[PDB]
Amino acid sequence: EKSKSSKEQKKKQKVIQVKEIKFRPGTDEGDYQVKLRSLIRFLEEGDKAKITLRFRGREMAHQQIGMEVLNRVKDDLQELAVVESFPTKIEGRQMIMVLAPK
Amino acid sequence: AKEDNIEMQGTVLETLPNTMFRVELENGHVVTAHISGKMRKNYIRILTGDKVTVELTPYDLSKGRIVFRS
RNA sequence: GGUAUG
RNA sequence: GGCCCCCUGGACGAAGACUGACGCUCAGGUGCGAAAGCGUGGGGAGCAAACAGGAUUAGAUACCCUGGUAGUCCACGCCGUA
RNA sequence: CCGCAAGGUUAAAACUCAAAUGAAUUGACGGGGGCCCGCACAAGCGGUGGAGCAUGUGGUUUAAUUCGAUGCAACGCGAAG
RNA sequence: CAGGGCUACACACGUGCUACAAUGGCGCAUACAAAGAGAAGCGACCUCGCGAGAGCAAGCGGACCUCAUAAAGUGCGUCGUAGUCCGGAUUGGAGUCUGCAACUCGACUCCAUGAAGUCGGAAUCGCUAGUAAUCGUGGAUCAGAAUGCCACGGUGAAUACGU
RNA sequence: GCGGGGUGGAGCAGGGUAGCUCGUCGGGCUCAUAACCCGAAGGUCGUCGGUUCAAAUCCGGCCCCCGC
Numbered sequence: 001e002k003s004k005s006s007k008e009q010k011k012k013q014k015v016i017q018v019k020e021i022k023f024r025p026g027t028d029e030g031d032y033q034v035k036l037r038s039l040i041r042f043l044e045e046g047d048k049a050k051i052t053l054r055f056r057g058r059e060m061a062h063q064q065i066g067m068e069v070l071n072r073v074k075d076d077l078q079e080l081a082v083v084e085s086f087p088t089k090i091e092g093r094q095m096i097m098v099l100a101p102k
Numbered sequence: 103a104k105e106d107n108i109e110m111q112g113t114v115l116e117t118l119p120n121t122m123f124r125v126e127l128e129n130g131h132v133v134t135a136h137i138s139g140k141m142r143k144n145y146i147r148i149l150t151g152d153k154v155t156v157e158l159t160p161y162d163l164s165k166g167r168i169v170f171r172s
Numbered sequence: 173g174g175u176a177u178g
Numbered sequence: 179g180g181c182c183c184c185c186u187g188g189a190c191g192a193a194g195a196c197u198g199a200c201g202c203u204c205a206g207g208u209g210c211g212a213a214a215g216c217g218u219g220g221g222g223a224g225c226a227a228a229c230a231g232g233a234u235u236a237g238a239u240a241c242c243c244u245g246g247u248a249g250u251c252c253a254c255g256c257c258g259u260a
Numbered sequence: 261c262c263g264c265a266a267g268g269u270u271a272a273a274a275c276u277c278a279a280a281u282g283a284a285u286u287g288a289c290g291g292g293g294g295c296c297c298g299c300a301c302a303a304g305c306g307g308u309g310g311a312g313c314a315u316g317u318g319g320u321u322u323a324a325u326u327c328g329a330u331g332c333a334a335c336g337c338g339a340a341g
Numbered sequence: 342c343a344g345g346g347c348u349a350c351a352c353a354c355g356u357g358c359u360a361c362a363a364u365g366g367c368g369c370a371u372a373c374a375a376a377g378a379g380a381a382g383c384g385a386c387c388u389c390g391c392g393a394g395a396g397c398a399a400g401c402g403g404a405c406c407u408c409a410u411a412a413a414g415u416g417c418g419u420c421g422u423a424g425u426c427c428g429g430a431u432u433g434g435a436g437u438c439u440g441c442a443a444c445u446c447g448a449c450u451c452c453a454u455g456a457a458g459u460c461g462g463a464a465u466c467g468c469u470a471g472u473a474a475u476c477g478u479g480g481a482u483c484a485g486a487a488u489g490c491c492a493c494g495g496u497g498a499a500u501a502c503g504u
Numbered sequence: 505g506c507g508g509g510g511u512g513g514a515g516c517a518g519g520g521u522a523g524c525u526c527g528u529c530g531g532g533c534u535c536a537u538a539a540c541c542c543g544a545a546g547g548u549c550g551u552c553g554g555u556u557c558a559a560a561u562c563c564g565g566c567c568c569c570c571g572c
C-alpha cells in the first residue's frame with residue numbers, strides 16, 4: 001500500500017556513513033589542509049571519518065612519522081571531534097583512527 | 103691531491119624534489135644535502151627518518167652529499 | 173567488458 | 179529551412195543597344211559580425227549553467243538519476259569575440 | 261582607446277631554457293578495427309587449496325643455522341642422494 | 342683437525358606423498374608384464390630368526406646366474422557404514438643392518454600406541470588416447486640413506502557444441 | 505537531579521533462537537600496490553540474582569556511565 005509513504009516519512013529520520021580520508025606519511029601542508037577541510041565537512045554534516053595512514057615499502061620503518069600526522073589531525077579537529085579509536089600497532093601497513101561528530 | 107671532506111652522520115628531516123633532503127647532522131646543524139651519484143645509479147632510496155652519512159665541505163656548511171644510508 | 177597507479 | 183503575402187538586396191544566361199578606363203587594392207576610417215554575456219521591459223512549453231536532493235567512489239566539488247534558477251524566446255540598446 | 265560591466269583592442273621587458281616545432285619513418289602501445297593459433301577458454305575427467313606427513317623456500321631463531329636460485333622463466337631448483 | 346651446524350621452529354608459501362573407505366579393508370588361494378642393474382658387485386638354494394635379517398654357500402662380468410612373488414586382477418571368506426577390521430600420524434619398549442661412528446641426525450623390523458582426517462572457502466593446476474586416472478616394476482647418485490628425479494610396463498576412461 | 509545505554513578490539517543490530525561495520529590476522533587476485541575476493545580469531549552479551557520453559561531478552565537492585 002501507499003503504506004510505503006509511511007516509510008518515506010520514516011526515512012526522513014536520518015543516517016550516518018563513515019567517510020574515509022587516506023593520509024600518507026609525508027603529505028604536504030596544502031593537501032593536508034584540503035583533506036582536513038574534507039573532514040571538517042564530513043563531520044559537521046553528521047558523519048564519521050575512518051582516517052587511514054598507509055605506509056608503503058620501507059616507510060613502515062619510520063611508523064613514528066605517521067603517528068605524528070594522525071596526532072596533528074586529532075589536535076586540529078579538536079573542538080569538532082571525539083576520537084572513537086586511535087591505533088598503536090601498524091597492522092598491515094595501516095593506522096586507522098576513527099573520528100566521530102562531537 | 104684533492105682537498106678533503108668532512109663526513110658526519112645525520113637524520114633526514116624532510117624529503118625535497120629531485121633527490122634533495124634536509125638533514126640534521128650530529129652537531130645539530132641542518133644542511134640541504136643531495137644524493138650521491140653512486141646511490142642514484144644503484145637506486146638506494148632515502149626517506150624521512152633515515153640515518154645518513156653526509157660529506158660536507160668547508161666552503162659551505164649549509165650543503166652536503168649523502169654518500170651512505172644506514 | 174572498461175579502475176587507477178608505477 | 180513549414181506554408182502564404184508585403185517590402186527588399188545580390189547572382190546568372192540570351193541576344194543586342196549604350197557609356198567610354200569611369201579600373202584594381204586599400205594604412206587610418208566606417209559598418210556588419212555565431213554563442214555566451216550585459217542593461218531595461220516582456221515572455222517562459224521544452225531544455226538547462228548555478229543550485230538542491232539521490233547515487234557512484236579512496237575521494238567525487240564530476241561523469242549517472244530526480245528536480246531546477248539564470249539563460250535559451252521577443253523588443254530596444256550594449257558587447258565585438260570563436 | 262573602447263565598454264554599464266564582463267572584458268575587448270593596441271602591446272613590451274626583465275628573466276629563464278637549448279631547445280620549442282612541422283611532416284613523415286620504424287617499432288611499441290590502445291578500455292581502436294579485422295583475420296588466426298595453443299588443454300588459452302569451453303566440454304570433461306582427476307587434482308591443488310582443508311587433514312597428517314615428506315620436501316624446498318621465506319621468515320624468525322642461532323655460535324653457525326654455508327653459498328647460490330626469486331613473477332611467468334626461484335621455491336622435491338645447483339644437490340644424481 | 343675434532344665437535345657442532347646446514348636437520349633449528351610462534352609462523353607464512355611452493356612441490357609432493359598418504360588418506361578420509363565398501364568401485365573398500367583384512368585373510369586365504371590363484372593369473373598375466375615391460376624395462377633395467379651387477380665384481381671390494383648382484384648373491385640363489387639350504388639352515389636359523391615372528392620379522393628386519395644372520396650363517397653356510399652355488400652361479401653369474403650375464404638372452405645362461407642373481408637382484409626378482411609384478412601389483413592392480415580373479416575367486417572364495419569375512420567386516421556391514423562405524424571415526425569402523427577406515428586412516429597410520431605420534432609416542433613407549435624391544436631389535437636388525439650399513440658404517441671408525443647412527444646423541445644431536447639413518448633406513449628398516451617386532452610388540453604396543455592408534456592423532457588429524459568423514460572428500461576440503463575464496464581461489465587455483467594438469468590432461469585430447471594407450472592420454473588422464475590408477476597399479477605395480479626398474480635405474481642413476483649411493484657404505485647406508487627417496488614420498489624426489491629419470492625410465493618401464495599392466496588396467497584403462499570421460500569430453501571437445503564451439504572461439 | 506533526570507535519562508539513555510552498557511553486545512567480539514571497534515562500535516551498533518539483536519522476551520528464548522548473538523550478528524553487522526571497521527579493526528585483527530592469514531590467504532586469493534596483480535608484474536606490483538591500493539581496490540576487489542575468501543577464510544579464521546575475537547564475545548557471552550554491565551553486574552547481581554530472582555523470575556520466565558528462556559536471561560542480551562523479563563523484573564528489580566547495583567555498577568554505572570556520560571547527555572543533561
Ligand SMILES: NC(=O)OC[C@@H](O)C[C@H](NC(=O)[C@H]1NCCC[C@H]1O)C(=O)N[C@@H](Cc1c[nH]cn1)C(=O)N[C@H](C(=O)O)[C@H](O)c1c[nH]c(Cl)n1
Binds near residue numbers: 234241
Ligand atoms: N567513482 C569513482 O571514483 O570510481 C568509480 C568509477 O570508476 C566507476 C566507473 N564509472 C564510469 O565508468 C563512469 N562512466 C561515465 C558514466 C558514469 C560512470 O559509470 C564504472 O565502473 N562504471 C560502471 C557502473 C558503476 C559505477 N559504480 C559501480 N559501477 C559502468 O557500467 N560503466 C560503464 C563503462 O565502463 O562502460 C559506462 O560508463 C556506464 C553505463 N552506465 C553508466 Cl552510469 N556508466
Ligand SMILES: [K+]
Binds near residue numbers: 204
Ligand atoms: K583609396
Ligand SMILES: [K+]
Binds near residue numbers: 247
Ligand atoms: K527556468
Ligand SMILES: [K+]
Ligand atoms: K589595456
Ligand SMILES: [K+]
Ligand atoms: K628569450
Ligand SMILES: [Mg+2]
Binds near residue numbers: 203
Ligand atoms: Mg578590393
Ligand SMILES: [Mg+2]
Ligand atoms: Mg544570444
Ligand SMILES: [Mg+2]
Ligand atoms: Mg535581458
Ligand SMILES: [Mg+2]
Ligand atoms: Mg531537466
Ligand SMILES: [Mg+2]
Ligand atoms: Mg542533470
Ligand SMILES: [Mg+2]
Ligand atoms: Mg581572434
